[PDB]
TrEMBL record, chains A, B:
Organism, as annotated: Variovorax paradoxus (strain S110)
Start and end residues of each HTH marR-type domain: 4-136
Listed GO biological process terms: response to stress
One Pfam family per UniProt: MarR
Record-linked PROSITE patterns: HTH_MARR_2 (PS50995)
Name of this protein: Transcriptional regulator, MarR family
Keywords assigned: DNA-binding, Transcription, Transcription regulation
Signal sequence range: none
Gene Ontology molecular function: DNA binding; DNA-binding transcription factor activity
Sequence positions that bind (indol-3-yl)acetate: S19, H23, R37
InterPro entries (alphabetical): HTH_MarR-typ, MarR/SlyA-like, WH-like_DNA-bd_sf, WH_DNA-bd_sf
Length: 140, 140
């Protein structure tokens, strides 16, 4: 059957199944999916643009802006002007947001280790390498 | 940074970027994303359950049921009773739906070939193999 080997379908199914496993943990720790994606994407990062955040969190930019309105109100993130461009807003995690998400990030790493363990280090690194190359070739 | 190598984030970004490329083609041919996923998942398939269709199309089951209401009204799919279980509904593509989607499926195969060409046959097959194994290990 067409769908059994069609790459976009395989990527989307694998992504949904693994992510839905971790979302149960995230919600048990008081996070929504979008809050978790934003804080995990910003943790240990320099400030990035709203558009970059939208791409890496796979969230539409108007949705991200509304999310940042409330996460900034809760002191978990901060928006800042671009040092040069008046049309670009940067965003960073605050210390409060980092402390809020650090434990969950450790649980995320453990869950990822469990997902990748049956494949071995070689196949795991090959998968991550291929995905990174694909993203860098298709990002706008 | 955590997010740069986190497998669920890599899978979701790669999936979104590649799929969004093909969705432009699908809509130019008059398909919505959900209609394309249903018809492509059913093409060349025996009847499958609603729950199976929801999993492979990564669409919530109530959403799939509403979608099938209108696709069945347009004669593109047919729901049928399970030969044994009264609690299971099966669904299939009709000849009309297959003829509607066949050309688009060829374009999908060409787009996939372009996406995978830089990686080579070995890395492409390794990726598809790993994704299939991951789905089969995490599907409920
Ligand atoms: O490209 C998409 O629309 C998402 C990938 C995808 C998930 N399930 C699918 C079933 C058939 C064709 C494509 C898909
Ligand atoms: O697990 C998810 O919520 C989807 C995967 C995902 C996409 N972008 C992300 C950014 C940070 C952490 C996880 C993700």
């Amino acid at each position: 059957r067409f769908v059994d080997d069609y790459l976009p379908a395989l990527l989307a199914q694998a992504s949904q199944l693994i992510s839905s496993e971790f979302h149960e943990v995230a919600r048990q720790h008081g996070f929504s999916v979008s809050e978790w994606r934003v804080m995990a994407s910003l943790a240990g990062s320099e400030p990035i643009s709203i558009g970059q955040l939208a791409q890496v969190t796979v969230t539409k930019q108007p949705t991200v802006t509304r999310l940042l309105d409330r996460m900034e109100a809760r002191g978990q993130v901060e928006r800042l002007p671009h040092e040069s461009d008046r049309r670009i807003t940067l965003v960073r995690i605050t210390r409060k947001g980092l402390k809020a998400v650090e434990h969950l990030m450790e649980l995320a790493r453990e869950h990822e280790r469990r997902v990748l363990e049956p494949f071995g280090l070689r196949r795991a690194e090959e998968l991550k390498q291929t995905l990174r190359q694909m993203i860098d070739l298709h990002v706008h």
